[PDB]
Amino acid sequence: SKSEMRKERINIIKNLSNDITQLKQLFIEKTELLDKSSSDLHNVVIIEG
């Protein structure tokens, strides 16, 4: 029991870490994509002449 209970603890903690991994990967990815669009926006500007 308790051996496999601990293994399935590890499994559900692994699932939770997969959820955190989804959070990190996709949100940092789309955030850096927003930053790419920001350099398209905030860093492609015309003012002077």
């Binding site: 350099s39 398209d40 860093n43 492609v44």
Partner: peptide, 9 residues
């Protein structure tokens, strides 16, 4: 740092 829109210009 350096950007590609530099190279676009």
């Amino acid at each position: 740092i350096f950007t590609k829109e530099d190279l676009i210009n």
